[PDB]
């Protein structure tokens, strides 16, 4: 019943059972400020059964510092009543309500209770009831640059998945009678001691196929032991083992009991003595609020700081905490008590929403129990922060001014950023910039570029879009939405529809890139990331990269002249299977899926393109005869798709589908078995179909079978679409037409003048002339996974399952086929929120212009296990050139537009280096091993003229520089690396 057209990406993270259990849970949220609204948004997008809000406090202006569903026309109205209407639109399956008053018994109606902006006494009163009634209780708090999370899911929490990883599966070479199991060649199982596994498709030991879990004894990186298997058999040949995961019982402690003896979670290992400080500090904040009618300490006030420290001392004495309080840090917590940032709110909202999903679905390992976080390194130091500058000014930025001050607000308001991409991270980044007030001054500006269009599956984690916006450009919708959120950004945002790449240099040129202040990436492919990194390196602009994958996320910051660039780090490459494995000898479902995709492309895409090009290009045949690798194949495809096998109705399409079934699942296997019989042996006497090779078996077409019928339907529908006919789905027509089919006789064949040319000429003279068919075009089938009515994934699944039946491989359903064929990347809204929060916390460091490399942090996190880590950026490598210090990445040579000979002489004289190779991009301009005549012809030419002559392409009018890569040798003959040359045209 799960709408897989909307939760497509989330299901690959959670699953069908997890979401089905999640759609039956009620969540109550107390407090509707920035953190509360963020949690509510993430929960609503997640897909819980319902959400209830409770916040009777009337709105104030400063509450807009992080609440993006509030407007200045709502001042004086309770926050819940003005937030419910805007929250109800995020998801149509998640009703949102508001309760006027909250009685304790009412809490029995919900599955999870989230508490924010609530005093300690009320939290204790609520928890004393939600603990003994087995209701999950999550309490969050955000004070300035500090945050706290507390989780309590009862004393008998049952966790099914504890790490978020899929069960470990592997293919077995053989199993002895002593329980020793070995993987295939050079394959590591990766199991640990004490795990449980089950065996399937094991030959010789059918008893082990039941699935009863067995103990695992790791005997090595490639072998392990399971015990005694004497009774069931003596030896097992082949098979697949799958890990079995057992539930874990986690027992939480109530808030009242855990106040005295807390259990901490450390978000960073460089500072592990702080959480004991924050535990006292937050309780002191609550006590101070209770002692002054709920009013937190004023920003940067010394008297309130002293009183807060007295309260901290009293609390520490009362609770028998043997910890020496840190006056500086505690008073810092006091100063930023009234702060309210959107980056901290986004980070904690993502974390708490993930905790809510953990509580509802009984999946992943939750926080146990306290999580205290701080980003105090983001506090500016180049401006004046004091009581005079941090006082509120009666504006919507008070929650930020109380932390950073008015001067830093002016610094933020004059930014000129550039956001690449408008995905989920792009939407969150734009929201954060709108809330922070980025580029709201006279000299500020924002630019966002993206060339994709909104789809239904994107609405699950991109909250700036609506179902009515499907099909429109992302950048325009995002800019309009964020202008609505913050009216001051009206006219300060420019949205492009251009793909960032080599062809867009006419728009994103030197003039555009010389006015920016920073560049933020929200992309999803490595190529565009590398290109943007190179452009930033050339123009010396700070860059902010951020990526997500399911529940994992990372953020990196690149600073000019300080840290290394994005391209300095290399990631593991994608895995490509051997051609011989896909063509003849598959052994996994991925191989069959790849083969099915190739079959789809070669059946419904390439012949159509050849036919269309023949009917468009006047001289296609002659060029194809002497250019194409298989001109005979092209001619046969044209003949088959024009004359020989041109359908006239749907019955002929069904006949062709049956013919292709026989041709690809019955005859090719027969030929392969004829070439390599099942009893054949290698040159060494070993059996052939052994180990990584499985003996196939031809398929006989049984109409009553489901897979055969599915393949026939899909192939007939795709062929009819190619010829623009009308497809049908009733089984009656298929059964009737396929009943009267006579399979042509087939037998394997051993093989054994200008006749070939005359054969080609016979094919050619049979082709109808191009002029006879004018305006007749065939529609190629462009693969589209996201559409469910185009018969693409259905055909791929059917073909993959049929080939798996050929080679006795376990078939996969349409879910896994769609996941594999489409290269779908799992994604979550919570991960997006967290990465946006981290990026925006680094942005305030970038604005302040911090110089030391110890003040920046690259972040990594995994929400399936509650892991957060931060490490300093890697410094840019240095080098010695002519006895001088040179930065390897952020240095260049600036030279005029001189002749090649003058350039060589300059390098010989000024740098004392001999130039041995000079290239411009992918063209070799000059080399020391070229013949003298060519050099003498090229030496007296200017660099621009030389480049134009070599590349056979005139320089564009907007071109203003040339980047030259030069390899030069020293006087002794030793190669020395030098930075690139920036020729100024």
């Amino acid at each position: 019943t799960i709408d897989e057209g909307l939760y497509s990406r989330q299901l690959y993270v959670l699953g069908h059972e997890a979401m089905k259990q999640m759609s039956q849970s009620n969540v109550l949220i107390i407090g509707c400020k920035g953190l509360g609204v963020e949690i509510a948004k993430n929960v609503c997008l997640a897909g819980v059964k319902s959400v209830t809000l409770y916040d009777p406090q009337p709105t104030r202006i400063e509450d807009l510092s992080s609440q993006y569903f509030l407007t200045e026309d709502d001042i004086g109205v309770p926050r819940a009543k003005v937030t419910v209407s805007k929250l109800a639109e995020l998801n149509q399956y998640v009703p949102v309500s508001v309760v006027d008053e909250l009685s304790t018994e009412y809490l029995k109606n919900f599955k999870c209770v989230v508490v924010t902006e609530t005093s300690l006494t009320k939290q204790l009163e609520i928890n004393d009831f939600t603990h003994k009634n087995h209701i999950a209780y999550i309490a969050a708090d955000s004070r300035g640059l500090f945050g706290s999370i507390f989780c309590d899911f009862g004393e008998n929490f049952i966790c099914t998945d504890t790490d978020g990883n899929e069960p470990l599966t592997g293919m077995i070479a053989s199993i002895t009678d002593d329980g020793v199991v070995t993987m295939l060649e050079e394959t590591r199982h990766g199991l640990e001691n004490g795990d449980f596994v089950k065996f399937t498709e094991v030959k010789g030991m059918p008893g082990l196929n039941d699935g009863t879990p067995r103990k695992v004894e790791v005997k090595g990186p490639y072998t392990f032991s399971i015990g005694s298997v004497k009774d069931l058999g003596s030896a097992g040949y082949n098979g697949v083992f799958t890990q079995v995961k057992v539930p874990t019982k986690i027992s939480f402690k109530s808030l009242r009991e855990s106040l005295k003896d807390p259990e901490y979670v450390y978000p960073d290992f460089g500072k592990m003595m702080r959480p004991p400080q924050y535990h006292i500090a937050f309780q002191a904040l609550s006590a101070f609020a209770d002692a002054h009618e709920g009013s937190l300490p004023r920003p940067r006030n010394d008297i309130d700081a002293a009183e807060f420290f007295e309260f901290c001392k009293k609390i520490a004495s009362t609770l028998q905490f043997d910890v020496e309080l840190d006056e500086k840090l505690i008073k810092e917590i006091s100063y930023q008590a009234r702060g309210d940032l959107v980056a901290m709110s986004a980070f904690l909202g993502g974390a708490v929403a993930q905790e809510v999903l953990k509580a509802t679905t009984s999946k992943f390992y939750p926080l146990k129990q306290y999580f205290y976080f701080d980003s105090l390194e983001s506090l500016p130091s180049s401006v004046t922060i004091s009581e005079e500058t941090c006082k509120p000014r009666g504006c919507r930025y008070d929650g930020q001014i109380a932390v950073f001050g008015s001067e830093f607000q002016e610094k933020i308001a004059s930014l000129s950023t550039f956001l690449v991409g408008a995905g989920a991270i792009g939407c969150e980044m734009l929201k954060n910039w709108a809330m922070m007030g980025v580029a709201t001054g006279e000299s500020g500006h924002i630019s966002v570029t993206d060339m994709d269009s909104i789809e239904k599956s994107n609405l699950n984690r991109q909250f700036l879009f609506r179902p009515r916006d499907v099909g429109k450009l992302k950048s325009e919708c995002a800019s309009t939405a964020v202008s609505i959120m913050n009216p001051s950004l009206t006219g300060k945002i420019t949205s492009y529809q251009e793909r960032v790449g080599p062809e867009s240099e006419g728009i994103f040129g030197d003039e555009f890139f010389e006015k920016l202040s920073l560049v933020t990436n929200a992309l999803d492919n490595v190529e565009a990331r590398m290109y943007v990194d190179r452009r930033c390196v050339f123009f010396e602009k700070p860059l902010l990269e951020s990526g997500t994958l399911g529940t994992k996320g990372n953020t990196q910051v690149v600073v000019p002249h300080l840290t290394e660039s994005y391209g300095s780090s290399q990631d593991p490459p994608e895995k490509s299977f051997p051609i011989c494995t896909l063509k003849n000898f598959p052994n996994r479902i991925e191989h069959t899926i790849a083969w099915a995709r190739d079959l789809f492309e070669g059946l419904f895409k390439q012949p159509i393109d050849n036919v269309n090009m023949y009917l468009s290009s006047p001289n296609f045949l002659e060029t194809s005869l002497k250019t194409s690798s298989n001109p005979r194949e092209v001619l046969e495809n044209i003949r088959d798709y024009l004359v020989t096998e041109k359908p006239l109705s749907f019955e002929e399409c069904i006949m062709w589908a049956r013919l292709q079934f026989d041709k690809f699942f019955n005859n090719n296997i027969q030929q392969l078995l004829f070439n390599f019989p099942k009893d054949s042996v290698t040159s060494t006497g070993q059996p052939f179909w052994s180990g990584p090779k499985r003996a196939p078996t031809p398929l006989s077409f049984d109409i009553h079978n489901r897979e055969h019928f599915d393949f026939i339907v899909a192939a007939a529908s795709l062929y009819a679409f190619n010829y623009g006919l009308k497809s049908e789905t009733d089984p009656a027509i298929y059964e009737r037409v396929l009943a009267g089919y006579n399979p042509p006789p087939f037998a394997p064949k051993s093989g054994i003048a200008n006749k070939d040319k005359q054969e080609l000429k016979s094919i050619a003279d049979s082709l109808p002339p191009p002029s006879s068919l004018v305006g007749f075009r065939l529609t190629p089938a462009e693969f589209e996974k996201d559409d469910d009515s185009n018969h693409h994934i259905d055909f791929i699944t059917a073909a993959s399952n049929l080939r798996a039946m050929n080679y006795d491989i376990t078939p996969a359903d349409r879910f896994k086929t769609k996941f594999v064929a489409g290269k779908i990347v799992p994604a979550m809204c919570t991960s997006t929120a967290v990465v946006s929060g981290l990026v925006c916390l680094e942005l305030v460091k970038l604005v302040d212009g911090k110089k030391k490399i110890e003040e920046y942090k690259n972040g990594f996190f995994n929400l399936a296990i509650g892991l957060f880590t931060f490490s300093d950026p890697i410094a840019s490598p240095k080098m010695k050139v002519n006895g001088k210090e040179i930065d390897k990445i952020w240095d260049r040579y600036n030279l005029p537009d001189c002749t090649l000979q003058e350039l060589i002489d300059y390098f010989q004289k000024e740098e004392g280096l001999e130039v041995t190779m000079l290239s411009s991009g992918v063209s070799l301009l000059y080399a020391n091993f070229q013949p003298p005549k060519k050099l003498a012809e090229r030496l007296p030419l200017k660099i621009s003229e030389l480049v134009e002559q070599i590349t056979k392409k005139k320089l564009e009018p907007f071109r203003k520089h040339l980047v030259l890569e030069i390899c030069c040798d020293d006087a002794n003959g030793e190669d020395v690396e030098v930075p690139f040359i920036c020729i100024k045209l």
């Binding site: 290239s919 063209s923 890569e965 390899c967």
Partner: protein, 147 residues
């Protein structure tokens, strides 16, 4: 990338491979037209085979793409010229020169590997009727690999 390619090209220039001659197409450093000479003690004796080499962007951290152009009757080479070679898929390391790859391809030409073929019919003919395989290889290398 570019520096490594230039180093390899200079090394090829200094030492003539005799049996091989690789060089960039036109002036593009990411497209080479390599030449291989048929081994003497092989059915492909007296034949010249031209190969297309495309270097990846992340070279040498990724293996190059090598495709035959002259038609060859070999068990491990199909009609499109694709090569079933170990040092081009997983055994590639950022230490092997293009001369090493050309030598490996020459060795593969010297003696095929029918145990794990790419064109089953050719491998079957090789394993069953060796003389017919020799005749077919000589006919193909005379029709296509000469002139």
């Amino acid at each position: 990338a570019l520096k490594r390619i230039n180093r390899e090209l200079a090394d090829l220039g200094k030492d003539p491979p005799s049996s091989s001659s690789a060089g960039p197409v036109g002036d593009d450093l990411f497209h080479w037209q390599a030449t291989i000479m048929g081994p003497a003690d092989s059915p492909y004796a007296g034949g010249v085979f031209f190969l297309s080499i495309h270097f990846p962007t992340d070279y040498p951290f990724k293996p190059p793409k090598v495709n035959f152009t002259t038609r060859i009757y070999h068990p491990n080479i199909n009609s499109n010229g694709s090569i079933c070679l170990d040092i081009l898929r997983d055994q590639w390391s950022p230490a092997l020169t293009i001369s090493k790859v050309l030598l490996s391809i020459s060795s593969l030409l010297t003696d095929p590997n029918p145990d794990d073929p790419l064109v089953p019919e050719i491998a079957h003919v090789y394993k069953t009727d060796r003389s017919r395989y020799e005749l077919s290889a000589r006919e193909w290398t005379r029709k296509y690999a000469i002139g």
